Amino acid sequence: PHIGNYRLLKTIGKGNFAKVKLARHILTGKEVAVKIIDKTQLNSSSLQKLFREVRIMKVLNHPNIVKLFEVIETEKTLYLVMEYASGGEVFDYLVAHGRMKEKEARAKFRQIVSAVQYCHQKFIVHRDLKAENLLLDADMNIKIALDAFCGAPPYAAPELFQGKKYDGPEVDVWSLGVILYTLVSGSLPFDGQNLKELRERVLRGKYRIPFYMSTDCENLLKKFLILNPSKRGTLEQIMKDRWMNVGHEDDELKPYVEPLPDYKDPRRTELMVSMGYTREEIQDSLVGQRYNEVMATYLLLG
Amino acid sequence: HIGNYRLLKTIGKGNFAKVKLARHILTGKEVAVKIIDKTQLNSSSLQKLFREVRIMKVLNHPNIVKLFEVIETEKTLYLVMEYASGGEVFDYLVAHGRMKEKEARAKFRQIVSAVQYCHQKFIVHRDLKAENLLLDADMNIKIALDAFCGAPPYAAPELFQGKKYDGPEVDVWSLGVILYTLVSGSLPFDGQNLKELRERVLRGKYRIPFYMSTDCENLLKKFLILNPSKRGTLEQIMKDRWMNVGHEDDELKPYVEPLPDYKDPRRTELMVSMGYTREEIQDSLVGQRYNEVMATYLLLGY
Numbered sequence: 001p002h003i004g005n006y007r008l009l010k011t012i013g014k015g016n017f018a019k020v021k022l023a024r025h026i027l028t029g030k031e032v033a034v035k036i037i038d039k040t041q042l043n044s045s046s047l048q049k050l051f052r053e054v055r056i057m058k059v060l061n062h063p064n065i066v067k068l069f070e071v072i073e074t075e076k077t078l079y080l081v082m083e084y085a086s087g088g089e090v091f092d093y094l095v096a097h098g099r100m101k102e103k104e105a106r107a108k109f110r111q112i113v114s115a116v117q118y119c120h121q122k123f124i125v126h127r128d129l130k131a132e133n134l135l136l137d138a139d140m141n142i143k144i145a146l147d148a149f150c151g152a153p154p155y156a157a158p159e160l161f162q163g164k165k166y167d168g169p170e171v172d173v174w175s176l177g178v179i180l181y182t183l184v185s186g187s188l189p190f191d192g193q194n195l196k197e198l199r200e201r202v203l204r205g206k207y208r209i210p211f212y213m214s215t216d217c218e219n220l221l222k223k224f225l226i227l228n229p230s231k232r233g234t235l236e237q238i239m240k241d242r243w244m245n246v247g248h249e250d251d252e253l254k255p256y257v258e259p260l261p262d263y264k265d266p267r268r269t270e271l272m273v274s275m276g277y278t279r280e281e282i283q284d285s286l287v288g289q290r291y292n293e294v295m296a297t298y299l300l301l302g
Numbered sequence: 303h304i305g306n307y308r309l310l311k312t313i314g315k316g317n318f319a320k321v322k323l324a325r326h327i328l329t330g331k332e333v334a335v336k337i338i339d340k341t342q343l344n345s346s347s348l349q350k351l352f353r354e355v356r357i358m359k360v361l362n363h364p365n366i367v368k369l370f371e372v373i374e375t376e377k378t379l380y381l382v383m384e385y386a387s388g389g390e391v392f393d394y395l396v397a398h399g400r401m402k403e404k405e406a407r408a409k410f411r412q413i414v415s416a417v418q419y420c421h422q423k424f425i426v427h428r429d430l431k432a433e434n435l436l437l438d439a440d441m442n443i444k445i446a447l448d449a450f451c452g453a454p455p456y457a458a459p460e461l462f463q464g465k466k467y468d469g470p471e472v473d474v475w476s477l478g479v480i481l482y483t484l485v486s487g488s489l490p491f492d493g494q495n496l497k498e499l500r501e502r503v504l505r506g507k508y509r510i511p512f513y514m515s516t517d518c519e520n521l522l523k524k525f526l527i528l529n530p531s532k533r534g535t536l537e538q539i540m541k542d543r544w545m546n547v548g549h550e551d552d553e554l555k556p557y558v559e560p561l562p563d564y565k566d567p568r569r570t571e572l573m574v575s576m577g578y579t580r581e582e583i584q585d586s587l588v589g590q591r592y593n594e595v596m597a598t599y600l601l602l603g604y
Contacts, residue, residue: 049494128495148494150451156496162464163504166497193350193449194429195457196467203464 001026003079004072004293006034017041022084025069027275028300032069035080050078056124057082058291061258064115064142066135070296081296085143087136090183091151099186102217103247109180110244110253111142116176117235118256120169127167129175130155131182153198154178154188159229161199170232177224184217185210189225203227216243263287268301304373304380306594307335313385318342323385326370328576329601333370336381351379357425358383359592362559365416365443367436371597382597386444388437391484392452395432400487400511403518404548410481411545411554412443417477418536419557421470428468430476431456432483454496455479455489459503460530471533478525485518486511490526504528517544564588569602 002008006023012033013020019036037050057068057080070081087093090108094100100108112134119126126133131151135143157174160166181189189207192198205227209218220243226232238244239253263286272282277294285294307324310332314321319338326333343351358369358381373380388394391409395401401409413435420427427434432452436444458475461467482490490508493499506528510519521544527533539545540554564587573583578595586595 045498046494127497146447146451149454149496149499151448152496153450153454160496160500161462163462166500193347195450195453195461196428197346198450199461199467 003034003036004070004081005296006032006081008034017046023081025081025296025300027297030300031084032300033066033082033084035078035082037078037080038076039078040076054078054080058289059122060119060124062115062118062256064111064144065118066143066145067299068291069299070293071291083143085135085137085145087138087140089132090134090136090142091131093136094182094186100183102184102214102243105180105183106243106246108140108142109183110248112144112179113176113235113239113244114253114256115142115144116172117239118258120172120235121255125167125169126172126175128152128155129172129179134179153192153195153202154190156202157229158203158205158227161203164229168229169234170229173224173232173235173238174226174229176235177221180217180221180224181207184213189221214243216246220244261286265298265302268298271301272297304335304382306597307333307382309335324382326382326597326601328598331601331604332385333601334367334383334385336383338379338381339377340379341377355379355381359590360423361420361425363416363419363557365412366419366445368600369592370600371594372592384444386436386438386446388439388441390433391435391437391443392432394437395483395487401484403485403515403544406481406484407545407547409443409484411549413445413480414477414536414540414545415554415557416443416445417473418540419559421473421536422556426468426470427473427476429453429456430473430480432480435480454499454503455491457503458530459506459528462500462504465530469530470535471530474525474533474536474539475527475530477536478522481518481522481525482508485514490522515544517547521545564599566599566603569599572602573598 005026007026009022009024011019012022017038021034021036023032023034024030025032039047039050042050054071058071061067066085067083068080069083070079072079072081116126116129133145135145137143155175155178157166157171159171178189190198190201192201205225207221207225220238220241223233223238223241236255239255244253245251263283269279269282272294273279277297281294282298284290285292286298289295306327308327310323310325312320313323313334319336322335322337324333324335325331338351340348355372362368367386368384369381370384371380371382373382417427417430434446436446438444456476456479458467458472460472479490491499491502493502506526508522508526521539521542524534524539524542537556540556546553564584570580570583574580576598578598582595583599585591586593587599
């Protein structure tokens with residue numbers, strides 16, 4: 001093991017100050033991703049973001065958001081152990097295979113929308129949903145995860161360009177429109193050679209309708225891509241959209257409700273008692289949502 | 303057909319354009335050749351392109367890459383221009399760290415001269431950047447993963463205030479950011495996302511590096527002014543003290559384009575010897591034709 005209970009396999013990501021590795025959890029054999037962050041090289045604002053991201057990750061339990069399994073904290077280095085999504089970016093998928101058929105777009109978008117709406121009902125807004133945030137797992141389910149500015153402005157809501165507040169759940173709404181447009185068209189509704197060009201198109205809010213797009217779909221684009229932030233619907237309302245629910249007639253997309261906590265699984269508890277864990281430390285680690293090695297093992301056992 | 307150049311390596315690939323290094327056959331001079339597939343461009347790209355060509359024909363400054371020839375076909379546009387073999391300033395900076403103020407100053411005088419020169423022609427650059435500053439073999443400035451990488455940190459604040467984004471005063475803001483990078487080797491305004499980048503730009507406050515002179519910091523304050531209409535012209539900023547340290551005989555002044563010489567007899571006679579007529583030499587130069595005749599004449603001048 002290189003850290004806690006994980007053998008680090010290969011580097012799947014490199015950053016100025018952070019590093020993502022593939023890893024094997026030794027007890028369970030399960031594959032995980034390990035985000036290895038060097039906190040010594042982080043400025044004040046980045047630490048604020050990192051600590052915010054950690055708080056948020058600990059709280060999100062949703063089939064389409066990558067799951068957090070462990071946080072290992074040292075003075076210099078933070079390790080985030082999380083679900084690996086092996087299918088890569090949706091970005092890269094559309095580049096490879098072109099636009100999705102509306103049918104396929106729909107299956108991925110219901111997951112995306114559910115996941116984001118799940119955040120909004122916890123008063124978490126993402127604020128910069130982009131291409132790279134959308135990952136696929138082995139079954140092509142959505143998992144929501146040169147510099148920060150690469151492929152960013154095309155997802156920005158008009159308010160950014162107007163001096164207005166950029167903080168409500170309605171900013172995610174805008175981005176979801178751009179996301180929807182990318183799924184079905186394989187390109188961006190708002191693009192330019194530079195910022196000035198990009199901004200004129202965004203503040204204008206008009207996008208090309210591709211000739212093959214359905215009116216249902218285009219109607220649903222209209223519900224995200226509204227210039228006035230305060231005139232944008234909640235995702236809870238957009239969930240009821242006709243296009244969203246084609247082929248889901250007994251099955252309207254509805255706000256996700258998370259399973260009730262299972263912190264007393266006799267099967268997994270007893271397995272860990274074997275390996276030499278105390279019953280009390282298990283429950284405490286789970287109830288207190290400790291994201292220590294105990295909880296990791298318990299989650300990973302599932 | 304570009305039979306008058308021998309194509310050597312590719313220096314750069316884009317989606318619908320490539321840059322090749324080439325040898326101009328008659329003179330042996332090395333050039334950059336941008337080969338643009340026009341059939342793959344949309345309307346606004348073509349506008350930008352025709353604009354770029356019109357701008358480049360008119361610019362003649364030793365710190366702006368010279369245009370030597372343009373070759374038009376229905377499907378393809380060929381821009382034969384000056385090759386700057388030193389790479390980008392951005393690159394050099396990451397390799398060497400900041401420039402000492404003495405060196406930054408030599409570079410920045412070139413940069414300011416070049417941009418101010420544009421401004422006297424009512425050409426505004428509108429997105430000056432790291433990318434856009436190249437170096438020749440002697441380390442002289444030559445003014446030349448998507449289009450949004452690195453762009454926002456150079457955006458002037460009006461971009462974010464819904465205010466117009468077309469003055470020479472936009473370039474002034476950019477020049478300030480450029481100065482700051484030369485002398486510090488990092489950006490004055492940065493962030494992990496658009497929102498954060500924007501808050502910084504709009505507050506307009508930047509970290510003063512400990513090693514920076516007060517002369518330099520005063521120069522920065524003349525560029526980095528929030529209110530667009532309160533920014534000096536480059537012509538005024540040229541008188542700045544920091545700008546003129548060690549140039550006391552030699553105050554930086556608006557560049558004066560040299561008088562047109564299309565009758566150089568050395569070059570004319572030499573070209574006659576190569577088999578050009580005196581007739582076409584006259585027409586091409588007086589006519590500013592940017593054809594093969596003019597490319598040779600221009601190229602013989604190095």
